[PDB]
C-alpha cells in the first residue's frame, strides 16, 4: 500500500485486562504505526514519574460524571488524561484500561480493542506476575526483583488501585481466585456491552495481524511475524536474572523484545 502522514494522537484503545497478550499488542502498534503505545511497562522503564499522576488521576475518577454531556469536574479529569498521553498513538494495559470509556471520548476518533483469553488461563498467569497470593513464596521473589527496577509500594498500589478501578470495585480481596475471576468475566461482558459493535475488535491470542490490520485499515507488517512476548516462563526469568545481578542494565541484552 502507499505511505500515508499518520496522526500522532491516540488512535487505538484497548481494553483488555492484563495478562491478556497486551504487551504483544503494544509491540505489534508500535511495528503498525512508528509511534509508542502505553502499557504499564512504559511506565516501569521509561515514566515512573507518572505513578503519582495516574494515583492522582484514579483518586479523582469517582467524580467523573459519564458524558454525554461534558460537566466542568470531568474536564479537568480528562484534560489530566489527555496529558498522561501526549506523544502516544495507542493505549493498553493497566493503568489506562479500566479508563476505556473516558478515553472514547476524549478521542471520539480511536478504534477499541479488547483482548480475551480462558479465565484460568488468564487467573494462572496473573498469579505468577501481577498478583501472586500473599502466602505464596515466589511473591518474595518478585518482589526483590522489582526493588532493583526501583518499584516501590506506590507502584503496588498503582497496580491495585487500577484493578479496583477497572473491576469498579470500592475494595478487593486479591488473594480471592473467586472474585478476580468473577471480576474477569463481568469486565470483559461490560466492554462488548458498552462500546458500539462498529468501533469495537474482541481478539484472541493468537489471532495475529489479519483482524487487528483489517479493523485499522493498514497493511499487514512485510515479513514481521505478530509479537509473541510476556508469558510467564520469560517474566520468571527476568525476576530471577534481576535477582542475580542486581541491575537491568547489566541484564537489558538478554531480554531483546522488552
Ligand atoms: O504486561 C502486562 C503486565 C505485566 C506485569 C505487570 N505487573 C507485574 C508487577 C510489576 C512488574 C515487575 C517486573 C516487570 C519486569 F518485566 F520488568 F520484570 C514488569 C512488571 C506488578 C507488581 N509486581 C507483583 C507484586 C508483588 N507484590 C505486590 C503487591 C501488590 C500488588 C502486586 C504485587 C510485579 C502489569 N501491571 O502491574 O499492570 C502488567
Ligand atoms: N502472540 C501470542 N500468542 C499467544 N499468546 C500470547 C501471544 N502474545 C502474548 N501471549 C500471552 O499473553 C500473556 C502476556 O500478556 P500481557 O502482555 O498482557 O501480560 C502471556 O500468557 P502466559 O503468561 O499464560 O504465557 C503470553 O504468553
Redesign the pocket.
Known amino acids: 500500500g502507499a505511505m500515508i502522514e499518520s496522526s500522532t494522537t491516540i488512535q487505538v484503545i484497548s481494553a483488555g485486562l492484563?495478562?491478556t497478550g497486551?504487551?504483544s499488542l503494544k509491540n505489534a502498534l508500535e511495528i503498525i504505526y512508528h509511534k509508542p503505545c502505553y502499557?504499564?511497562?512504559e511506565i516501569?522503564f521509561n515514566k515512573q514519574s507518572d505513578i503519582i499522576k495516574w494515583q492522582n488521576l484514579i483518586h479523582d475518577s469517582h467524580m467523573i460524571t459519564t458524558p454525554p454531556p461534558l460537566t466542568t469536574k470531568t474536564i479537568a479529569i480528562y484534560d489530566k488524561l489527555k496529558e498522561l498521553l501526549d506523544g502516544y498513538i495507542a493505549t493498553t494495559?493497566?493503568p489506562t484500561c479500566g479508563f476505556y470509556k473516558d478515553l472514547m471520548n476524549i478521542y471520539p476518533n480511536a478504534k477499541v480493542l479488547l483482548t480475551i483469553r480462558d479465565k484460568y488461563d488468564w487467573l494462572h498467569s496473573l498469579r505468577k506476575?501481577?498478583?501472586?497470593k500473599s502466602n505464596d513464596p515466589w511473591?518474595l521473589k518478585?518482589?526483590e526483583?522489582?526493588k532493583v527496577?526501583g518499584?516501590n509500594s506506590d507502584?503496588?498500589k498503582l497496580?491495585?488501585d487500577s484493578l479496583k478501578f477497572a473491576f469498579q470495585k470500592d475494595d478487593l480481596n486479591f488473594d480471592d481466585d473467586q472474585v478476580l475471576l468473577e471480576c474477569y468475566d463481568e469486565y470483559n461482558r461490560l466492554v462488548q456491552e458498552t462500546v458500539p459493535s462498529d468501533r469495537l475488535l474482541v481478539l484472541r491470542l493468537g489471532d495475529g495481524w489479519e483482524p487487528l490490520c483489517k479493523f485499522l485499515n493498514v497493511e499487514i507488517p512485510n515479513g514481521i511475524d505478530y509479537p509473541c512476548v510476556?508469558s510467564h516462563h520469560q517474566?520468571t526469568q527476568?525476576?530471577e536474572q534481576?535477582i542475580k545481578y542486581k541491575s537491568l542494565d547489566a541484564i537489558i541484552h538478554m531480554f531483546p523484545d522488552?
Not at 506476575?129 to 501472586?132: I, M, N, Q, S, T
Open positions: 492484563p495478562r497486551t504487551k502499557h504499564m511497562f516501569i494495559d493497566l506476575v501481577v498478583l501472586p511473591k518478585i518482589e526483583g522489582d527496577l518499584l507502584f503496588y497496580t491495585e510476556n517474566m527476568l525476576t534481576l522488552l
